[PDB]
Amino acid sequence: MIMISILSLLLSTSVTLRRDMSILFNRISIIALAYCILHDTMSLSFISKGIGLHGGLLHITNLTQIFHIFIFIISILILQLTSFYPRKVWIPEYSSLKDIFFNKILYYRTKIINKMGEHMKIIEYPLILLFVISGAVFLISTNDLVSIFLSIELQSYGLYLLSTIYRNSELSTTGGLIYFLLGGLSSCFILLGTSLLYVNSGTTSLDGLYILNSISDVNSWYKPYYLNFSLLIFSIGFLFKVSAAPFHFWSPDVYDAIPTIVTTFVAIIAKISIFIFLLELVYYTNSNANSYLSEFSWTYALLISSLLSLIIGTVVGLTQFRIKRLLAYSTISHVGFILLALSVSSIESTQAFIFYLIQYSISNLNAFFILITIGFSLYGYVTNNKEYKSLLDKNNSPIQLISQLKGYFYINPLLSLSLAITIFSFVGVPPLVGFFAKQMVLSAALDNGYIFLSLIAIITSVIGAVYYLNVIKEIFFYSPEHEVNPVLNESDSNFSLRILNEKNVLIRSVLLKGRNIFISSPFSITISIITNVILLFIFMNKEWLSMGTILVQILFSA
Amino acid sequence: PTPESEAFLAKKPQVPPTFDGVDYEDNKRLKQAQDAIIREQWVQVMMGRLVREELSKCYYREGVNHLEKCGKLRERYLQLLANAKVKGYLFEQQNYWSK
Amino acid sequence: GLQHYKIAMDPALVRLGSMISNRYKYFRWTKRTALVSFMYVVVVPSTIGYLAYKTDGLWDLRAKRRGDLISER
Amino acid sequence: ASSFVIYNISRPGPNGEPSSLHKWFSKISDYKDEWETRNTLMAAALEQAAHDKHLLLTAER
Amino acid sequence: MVNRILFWTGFGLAVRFWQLGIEMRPFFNRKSLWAYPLFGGVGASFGYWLQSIDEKQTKMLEERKQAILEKRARRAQRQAE
Amino acid sequence: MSLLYVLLIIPIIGIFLISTIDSFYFFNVSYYKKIALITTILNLIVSLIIYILFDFSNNQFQFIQENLDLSFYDIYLGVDGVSIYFVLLTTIIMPIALVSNWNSITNNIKSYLIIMLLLETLLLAVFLVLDVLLFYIFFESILPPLFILIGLFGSSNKVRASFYIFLYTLLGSLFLLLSILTMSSIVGTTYFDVLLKSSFEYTTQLFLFFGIFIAFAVKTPVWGLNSWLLRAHVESPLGGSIVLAAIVLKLSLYGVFRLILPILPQASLNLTYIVYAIGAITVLYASFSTLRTVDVKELIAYSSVAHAAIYLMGVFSNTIQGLEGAILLGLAHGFVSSGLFICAGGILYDRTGTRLIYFFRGLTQIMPLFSLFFFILCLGNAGTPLTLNFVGEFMSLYGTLERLPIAGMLASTSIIFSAAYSIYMYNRIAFGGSVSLYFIDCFRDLTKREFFILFTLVSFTVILGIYPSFVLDGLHYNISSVVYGIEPNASYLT
């Protein structure tokens, strides 16, 4: 379905150069990803560790299918930014069902809705995003060494093109260029990792290597040293892409350089797909019996990375004044928690790893939505700060600084509370969902003897809570540097809106001002749902937590 | 003696105060055992509170010759003073001495 | 946010409050000052703790009559 | 003045039964075994849940 | 007390509340009052769906917990041989 | 529906009521305080109905509700002897805290009222939840409303204070959380009834003791960890300061009655000499510094550190007298600390805009009513008899002394040293001359608002000082359960 959707969308895209089509090509892509959800939902009625598909090259697991569907929902939610206009005009005279379904509202919307904005004029943008999803989902399903390499490339190359699709931005071309170059270094490590596996073992099957590994677990000419340190090189190439330290340096720069609607999808999807792929590898390569092979486990990179990602993520985030550089360092400290749960391989830690990855991906997406919405709200607001005048590419990243958020609770209080709840959920404060995620990973690590990493993580969090609180301190504790626009609210300049009925006949003409201009519903509803999921998780935790209890039971059974 | 008032029917323990030969998994039983061991220690302490009331009555009633007329109540108080102390049910619950 | 009564604010008193407020920023480690910090944070509580440990369970008055000892250990 | 008036009606009597108001409070706050039966069924339900989690978490890989 | 259906009905109402607050639009505007039955009705529809998947999750763990005991019960049986 | 869940939801109605009226009626800011005030009175009424039904001689938790819908984190509520007076104290204080800022809060009145109403729901849930994970969920949930409250309505250095209350609490709690998580992995649950009857290895108890004690020594606060209190109890608004010194301080003392005493018996019995060293050093150092404190609010704040040590030593005394007096001390401390902040932070700072004691002298010439109450409150702070503060100090000190004579004796210096700073503060402000000559404008005395929040607060500390049987009676049977030990002639009766 995703492949039919790419080919069909590409044929329609290839016979048009009309930039007005970008909004409708994005709306059709959301319809396409909804069919993919209906198909992977139908495929969920089997209990199995894995079923080889297509000549052994691909596999399907309950974990593989629940993760494709999650990627599809997340993609539908990110695709909304390019599918609907940011702003809106709302009047009580146009607010009933008969009004919405049988009346029309005519007015000059070109400036109010930013019809000709850059996010609304890239025809191929949904198409390149579908290719990244195609690569992401194929990687979760990869069962061969060759399949892994092609799938990570199909995911990576599209992220390079998305990072560069704003071609008139010197900031995106630079972010795109850094990411392509250093990710190409990352892939050369991944190719070396796979190449050493096939060269020492004669097989491209992951299923064959897991069998060789399980026999070699006993308790003289061909000791299987290659598996642990071929997998080590293979692993470093994936720690670059999830931006786990000490391979993290690119992500603050790239995420800060590319536009914010783009940094939303590029900073979230690669992690879900890569972490799920590594989970099956870590389970099937663990030597239950202590052995010489155990002393050299490739998974110690993951602990070293999780250790480093905790210190690096929270400390370097202390003196970040740029909101996108802050969001990326917050991610490097959260991937440390993810890595720690991935390195302790146990039922409790696999439940914790699965819960943490889904909740952080919805929470980091809320953070991006609030950020994007806050910088679309500043349309009827004006500032006189020299710093806010000296910024670069203000159209692609409307909010670039933490200080730009100073006094936002006095401009829009509920959106500021929504960002407070999301940030407090990154801290790990109860009874929010992020606390429960952090507690589940601490409980698993404490049970399995990783007492030292648990102590690092708790001390690390208080350090990271410092810069999270400086964000909230900026929202709540000072006064706005932004002022209502004096001419958009002047009581002398008002545009005319006119309400017609089902057949091109006028009903009522209205005169409207800037106070009649609001955020479009698709973004306020999306922020509202994720905020309330985060807020009220304690009353709605049973089905979500049980979904992860069962997947772990299937993976560790038999 | 004095008949037991109705209030001394619900709060009377229905089971002798020990943890011997009992099942801790039976929650109804564990609590009653804890309650009963608490009930006895408290009654024992309140015996001290009556022997002192009785003793104080003599102490005024005799005065100079108090050391040789109600010393019999005095020994009773000292014996209770040495033993009757609310110590809880937790050391009993967690340790078995078994003679 | 409300306004208060009119006060003859004394700059000497006003500035004395500023220094007491902000004194924490100028503390340094010295031969003297570590000795003061070491006596009152380490040595003194270690002295009480040592005495508390060394005389714990040692005495009990509860009903010790004539001919018996306060001590129990 | 009120304290004396309230105290006089508070006294049940030398040998008389508790007053009508004296029985009403004891009736509403009776809970002869309501809390115990409710508590014991709750602890059993979480004992069993704790055992189930112990089973699932400690399952052999 | 948490009824899976009453909560999600209440959940949908609060999304509409939080929406209007974020949008800075008046709560309880009269011509738009239909959105509260609609957001509330959708939340209940989700709650019915969750209730169903919850029934399916109780069984799967009920089968698993039996399957763990049986795996464990027959394991010690061969040890006594 | 349980009365206990009624207690947790009425403030949520108030929040919902407050936030939607603007959609109904430019509504006057007076109305929202009327709703917030009434909402707290309703919680007080319900808590008073619960006490009139409460049974003082029952081990089973009372006013529980059947669930039979077990999830991974359900919310269970219970009321026994130890936790009811803490709930009773919270519902008594909160109306007074709102009245104390009836005029002082000007901007963001909706925000202030919503936080405090939310803050009330979270604080009651701490004393009502029936497992230790629920205890932690609600003991750390107060941090965001307290963080925003301080930095939205605070004094000049509110930013530093808000960062101190959030980062010390979070750190201590994380050490507590690592202990609660270890317990749940051993027992398989946290429910009080299941968890209490589990024993623990001696080594486990020692390591479980730390983490919990790291956490409760930050939140006590014991001296050397007390810098967050001096900042966040002064820079806070008066209502937040009242909640932070009457209610929040007492969650840790109650957390000893659920997390340390019944499940770590051996560990406590062997580590008391550390605790009494910390406690006595705390009394001794927190008294000398508050003798030299110039900020009038900081002197009142830092005397709480002095008293919180006395009832911290009483809960580790393994004595039925110490444990009871400790609850009485933390109950009486809530009344007297609340009044003293009202006197300093609410009556002086409102009139003068300053908190430097240099500017105050001989207010008795101009404020006869304020001098009156500010003298009973100073006597209660000094543990003068006829005051429940005295009974709590006396009963805690006997328990402390009976458990460790040298530590109780070094605690017993509090009689000398608490009167030293409580009367030295009284004679500098009320007495000591005619009036401070920095007042270029004469002062009005107590208003009717001030006269009534103080009249209540000193009423509670006095009535329960003549007749502390009102609290002591319901405490006896349930606090018997938290003692550890046996007598040779009364153990193992057959």
Coordinates of N, CA and C in Angstrom, one line a residue, chain F residues 376-470:
Chain F
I376 N 1.1 35.7 71.8 CA 0.7 34.3 72.0 C 1.4 33.4 71.0
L377 N 1.5 33.9 69.7 CA 2.2 33.1 68.7 C 3.7 32.9 69.0
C378 N 4.3 33.9 69.6 CA 5.7 33.8 70.0 C 5.9 32.9 71.2
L379 N 4.9 32.8 72.1 CA 5.0 31.9 73.2 C 4.8 30.5 72.7
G380 N 3.8 30.2 71.8 CA 3.7 28.9 71.2 C 4.9 28.4 70.5
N381 N 5.6 29.3 69.8 CA 6.8 29.0 69.1 C 7.9 28.6 70.1
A382 N 7.8 29.2 71.3 CA 8.7 28.9 72.4 C 8.3 27.7 73.2
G383 N 7.2 27.0 72.8 CA 6.6 25.8 73.5 C 6.2 26.2 74.9
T384 N 5.6 27.4 75.1 CA 5.1 27.7 76.5 C 3.8 26.9 76.7
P385 N 3.6 26.4 78.0 CA 2.4 25.6 78.3 C 1.1 26.3 77.9
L386 N 0.0 25.5 77.9 CA -1.4 25.9 77.5 C -1.4 25.9 76.0
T387 N -0.4 25.5 75.3 CA -0.2 25.5 73.9 C 0.1 24.1 73.4
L388 N -0.5 23.7 72.3 CA -0.4 22.2 71.9 C 1.1 22.1 71.5
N389 N 1.7 23.2 71.1 CA 3.2 23.1 70.7 C 3.9 22.6 71.9
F390 N 3.6 23.0 73.1 CA 4.3 22.6 74.4 C 4.1 21.1 74.6
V391 N 2.9 20.6 74.4 CA 2.6 19.2 74.7 C 3.4 18.3 73.6
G392 N 3.4 18.8 72.4 CA 4.1 18.0 71.4 C 5.6 18.0 71.6
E393 N 6.2 19.2 72.0 CA 7.6 19.2 72.4 C 7.9 18.4 73.6
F394 N 7.0 18.4 74.6 CA 7.3 17.7 75.9 C 7.2 16.2 75.6
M395 N 6.2 15.8 74.9 CA 6.1 14.3 74.6 C 7.1 13.8 73.7
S396 N 7.5 14.6 72.7 CA 8.6 14.2 71.8 C 9.9 14.2 72.6
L397 N 10.2 15.1 73.5 CA 11.5 15.2 74.2 C 11.6 14.0 75.2
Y398 N 10.5 13.7 75.8 CA 10.5 12.5 76.7 C 10.9 11.3 75.9
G399 N 10.2 11.1 74.8 CA 10.5 9.9 73.9 C 11.9 9.9 73.4
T400 N 12.4 11.1 73.0 CA 13.8 11.2 72.5 C 14.8 10.9 73.6
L401 N 14.5 11.4 74.8 CA 15.4 11.2 76.0 C 15.3 9.7 76.4
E402 N 14.1 9.2 76.5 CA 14.0 7.8 76.9 C 14.6 6.8 75.9
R403 N 14.8 7.2 74.7 CA 15.4 6.3 73.7 C 16.9 6.5 73.7
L404 N 17.4 7.8 73.7 CA 18.8 8.1 73.8 C 19.0 9.3 74.7
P405 N 19.4 9.0 75.9 CA 19.5 10.1 76.9 C 20.3 11.3 76.4
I406 N 21.5 11.1 75.8 CA 22.4 12.2 75.5 C 21.8 13.0 74.4
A407 N 21.1 12.4 73.4 CA 20.5 13.1 72.3 C 19.3 13.9 72.7
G408 N 18.4 13.3 73.6 CA 17.3 14.0 74.1 C 17.7 15.2 74.9
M409 N 18.8 15.0 75.7 CA 19.3 16.1 76.5 C 19.8 17.2 75.6
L410 N 20.6 16.9 74.5 CA 21.0 17.9 73.6 C 19.8 18.4 72.7
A411 N 18.8 17.7 72.6 CA 17.5 18.2 72.1 C 16.8 19.1 73.1
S412 N 17.0 18.8 74.4 CA 16.3 19.5 75.5 C 16.8 20.9 75.6
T413 N 17.9 21.3 75.0 CA 18.4 22.7 75.0 C 17.4 23.6 74.2
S414 N 16.4 23.0 73.5 CA 15.5 23.7 72.7 C 14.6 24.6 73.6
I415 N 14.3 24.1 74.8 CA 13.6 25.0 75.8 C 14.3 26.3 76.0
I416 N 15.6 26.2 76.2 CA 16.4 27.4 76.4 C 16.5 28.2 75.1
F417 N 16.7 27.5 74.0 CA 17.1 28.3 72.8 C 16.0 28.7 71.9
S418 N 14.8 28.0 72.0 CA 13.7 28.5 71.2 C 13.1 29.7 71.8
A419 N 13.0 29.8 73.1 CA 12.6 31.1 73.8 C 13.6 32.2 73.5
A420 N 14.8 31.9 73.2 CA 15.8 32.9 73.0 C 15.5 33.7 71.7
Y421 N 15.2 33.1 70.6 CA 14.9 33.8 69.4 C 13.5 34.2 69.2
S422 N 12.6 33.5 69.9 CA 11.1 33.9 69.8 C 10.8 35.1 70.6
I423 N 11.5 35.4 71.7 CA 11.3 36.6 72.5 C 12.2 37.7 72.1
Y424 N 13.4 37.4 71.6 CA 14.3 38.4 71.1 C 13.6 39.0 69.8
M425 N 12.8 38.2 69.1 CA 12.1 38.8 67.9 C 10.9 39.6 68.4
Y426 N 10.3 39.1 69.5 CA 9.1 39.8 70.0 C 9.5 41.2 70.6
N427 N 10.6 41.3 71.4 CA 10.9 42.6 72.0 C 11.5 43.5 71.0
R428 N 12.1 43.0 69.9 CA 12.6 44.0 68.9 C 11.5 44.6 68.0
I429 N 10.4 43.9 67.8 CA 9.3 44.4 66.9 C 8.2 45.0 67.7
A430 N 7.7 44.3 68.7 CA 6.6 44.9 69.5 C 7.1 45.9 70.5
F431 N 8.2 45.7 71.1 CA 8.7 46.5 72.2 C 10.0 47.1 71.8
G432 N 10.8 47.6 72.7 CA 12.1 48.1 72.5 C 12.2 49.5 72.1
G433 N 11.3 50.3 72.5 CA 11.2 51.7 72.1 C 9.8 52.2 71.7
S434 N 9.7 53.4 71.3 CA 8.4 54.0 71.1 C 7.7 53.5 69.8
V435 N 8.3 53.9 68.6 CA 8.0 53.3 67.4 C 9.3 53.5 66.5
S436 N 9.5 52.6 65.5 CA 10.6 52.8 64.7 C 10.5 54.2 63.9
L437 N 11.5 55.0 64.0 CA 11.5 56.3 63.4 C 11.7 56.3 61.9
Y438 N 11.8 55.1 61.3 CA 11.8 55.0 59.8 C 10.4 55.0 59.3
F439 N 9.4 55.0 60.1 CA 8.0 55.1 59.7 C 7.6 56.5 59.6
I440 N 7.6 57.0 58.3 CA 7.2 58.4 58.1 C 5.7 58.5 57.9
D441 N 5.0 57.4 58.3 CA 3.5 57.4 58.2 C 3.0 56.4 59.2
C442 N 2.0 56.8 60.0 CA 1.5 56.0 61.0 C 0.8 54.7 60.5
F443 N 0.7 53.7 61.2 CA 0.2 52.4 60.7 C -1.1 52.1 61.3
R444 N -2.0 51.5 60.5 CA -3.3 51.0 61.0 C -3.0 49.7 61.7
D445 N -3.8 49.3 62.6 CA -3.7 48.1 63.3 C -4.2 46.9 62.5
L446 N -4.5 45.8 63.1 CA -5.1 44.6 62.4 C -6.4 45.0 61.9
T447 N -6.7 44.6 60.6 CA -8.0 44.7 60.1 C -8.9 43.6 60.7
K448 N -10.1 43.5 60.2 CA -10.9 42.3 60.7 C -10.4 41.0 60.0
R449 N -9.9 41.1 58.8 CA -9.4 39.9 58.2 C -8.2 39.4 59.0
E450 N -7.3 40.2 59.3 CA -6.1 39.8 60.0 C -6.5 39.3 61.4
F451 N -7.4 40.0 62.0 CA -7.8 39.7 63.4 C -8.5 38.3 63.5
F452 N -9.0 37.8 62.4 CA -9.8 36.5 62.4 C -9.0 35.3 62.0
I453 N -8.0 35.5 61.0 CA -7.2 34.4 60.7 C -6.2 34.1 61.8
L454 N -5.8 35.2 62.6 CA -4.9 34.9 63.8 C -5.7 34.4 64.9
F455 N -7.0 34.8 65.1 CA -7.8 34.4 66.2 C -8.1 32.9 66.1
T456 N -8.3 32.4 64.8 CA -8.5 31.0 64.6 C -7.2 30.2 65.0
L457 N -6.1 30.7 64.4 CA -4.8 29.9 64.5 C -4.4 29.8 66.0
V458 N -4.5 30.9 66.8 CA -4.2 30.8 68.2 C -5.3 30.1 68.9
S459 N -6.5 30.0 68.4 CA -7.6 29.3 69.1 C -7.3 27.8 69.0
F460 N -6.8 27.3 67.9 CA -6.5 25.9 67.7 C -5.4 25.4 68.6
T461 N -4.3 26.3 68.7 CA -3.2 25.9 69.4 C -3.4 25.9 70.9
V462 N -4.4 26.7 71.4 CA -4.7 26.9 72.8 C -5.7 25.8 73.2
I463 N -6.8 25.7 72.5 CA -7.8 24.7 72.9 C -7.2 23.3 73.0
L464 N -6.5 22.9 72.0 CA -5.8 21.6 71.9 C -4.6 21.6 72.9
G465 N -4.3 22.8 73.5 CA -3.3 22.8 74.6 C -3.9 22.5 75.9
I466 N -5.1 23.0 76.2 CA -5.8 22.6 77.4 C -6.3 21.2 77.3
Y467 N -6.9 20.8 76.2 CA -7.4 19.5 76.0 C -6.9 18.8 74.7
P468 N -5.6 18.4 74.8 CA -5.1 17.6 73.7 C -5.7 16.2 73.5
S469 N -6.6 15.8 74.3 CA -7.3 14.5 74.1 C -8.1 14.5 72.9
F470 N -8.4 15.6 72.3 CA -9.2 15.6 71.0 C -8.4 15.0 69.9

